[PDB]
């Protein structure tokens, strides 16, 4: 159970919490703004999934400040996670290449 594998699991676990909180917070921030689309929990959930994967569909995006701040937190958490997996993967391959040359 090496650091990079511990950290990736921690990042993935953390991301799911950021997603769930992110869905919940979006709805609480958006409701009140006229025309806001992120006003239901299941909708905001899949919005979060899209946003965490840096994907935007049409005008399915927050309009409020805090809603957009949530979006920022979701995005950053998303990229950090899928950047940490790559880093963890890279560490695994470089470790084996060190074993490959007997180094």
């Amino acid at each position: 159970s090496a650091l990079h594998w511990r950290a990736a699991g921690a990042a993935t676990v953390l991301l799911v919490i950021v997603l769930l909180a992110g869905s919940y917070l979006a709805v609480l921030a958006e409701r009140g703004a006229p025309g806001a689309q992120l006003i239901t929990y299941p909708r905001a959930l899949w919005w979060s999934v899209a946003t965490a994967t840096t994907v935007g569909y049409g005008d399915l995006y927050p309009v409020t400040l805090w809603g957009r701040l949530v979006a920022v937190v979701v995005m950053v958490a998303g990229i950090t996670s899928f950047g940490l997996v790559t880093a963890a993967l890279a560490t695994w391959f470089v470790g084996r290449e060190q074993e490959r040359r007997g180094h």
Partner: antibody, heavy 118, light 108 residues
Framework: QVQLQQPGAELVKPGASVKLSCKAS????????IHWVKQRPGHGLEWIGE????????NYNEKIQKKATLTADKSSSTAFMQLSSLTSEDSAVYYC???????????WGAGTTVTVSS | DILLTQSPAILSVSPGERVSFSCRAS??????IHWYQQRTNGSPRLLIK???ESISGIPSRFSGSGSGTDFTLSINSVESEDIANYYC?????????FGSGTKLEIKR
């Protein structure tokens, strides 16, 4: 079982204020939203507001005048609607409804028949 | 604010026939719409959630149709207990809005 409970009727003098109550049993999540709907005699349904009891943030219909102000007591699971400066146009049945935060209002209240007269 | 339009206002039908209430939104709302039944003196009762999905306890005679702007609530074999006002309610954008309503009448 009956989920939401409202007083049957409320009498108010013209210009005076009134607080309306709405307690709830059964499943009461943190994510729950309590709305309030206005129905005049022989008229359609009219959304007035919504409030999440666990945080106390309320939203109001800005199309009509903001006469109401929403508050909620956490321990009693009861939502309140503070209406002030009432005219004859405020004489209506007022419903409270439980919304799981997914659009539809699943369970409704009995309704409070408010009459504005001297 | 989404404007919902229920045409016609009053709807008369023969007993045992099929009926259809239409509700049109001001703009595309997908399937984010809900139907409510309200009889005399009674409080609103949920019939069909999300355009077509049925609620348990609700008769199998009730079924929902439509997407986009055109939406329809339909009853097969209309009976006495169905005489009521019918309301469509959207949940696509804030704030939530209701239709004007459609009253069902049975010609016996």
């Amino acid at each position: 079982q009956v989920q939401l409970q409202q007083p049957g009727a409320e009498l108010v003098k013209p210009g005076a204020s009134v607080k309306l109550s709405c307690k709830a049993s059964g499943y009461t999540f943190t994510s729950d939203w309590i709305h309030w709907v206005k129905q005049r005699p022989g008229h359609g349904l009219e959304w007035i507001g919504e409030i999440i009891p666990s945080y106390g943030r309320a939203n109001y219909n800005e199309k009509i005048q903001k006469k109401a102000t929403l508050t909620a007591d956490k321990s009693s699971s009861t939502a309140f609607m503070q209406l002030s400066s009432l005219t004859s146009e405020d004489s209506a049945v007022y419903y409270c409804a439980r919304e799981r935060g997914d659009g539809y209002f699943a369970v409704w209240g009995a309704g409070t028949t408010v009459t504005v007269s001297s | 604010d989404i404007l919902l339009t229920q045409s016609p206002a009053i709807l008369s039908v023969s007993p045992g026939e099929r009926v259809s209430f239409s509700c049109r939104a001001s703009q595309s709302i997908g399937t984010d719409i809900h139907w409510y039944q309200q009889r005399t003196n009674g409080s609103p009762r949920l019939l069909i959630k999300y355009a077509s999905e049925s609620i348990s306890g609700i008769p199998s005679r009730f079924s929902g149709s439509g997407s986009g702007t055109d939406f329809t609530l339909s009853i097969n074999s209309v009976e006495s207990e169905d005489i009521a006002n019918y309301y469509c309610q959207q949940s696509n954008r804030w704030p939530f809005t209701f239709g004007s309503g459609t009253k069902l009448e049975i010609k016996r």
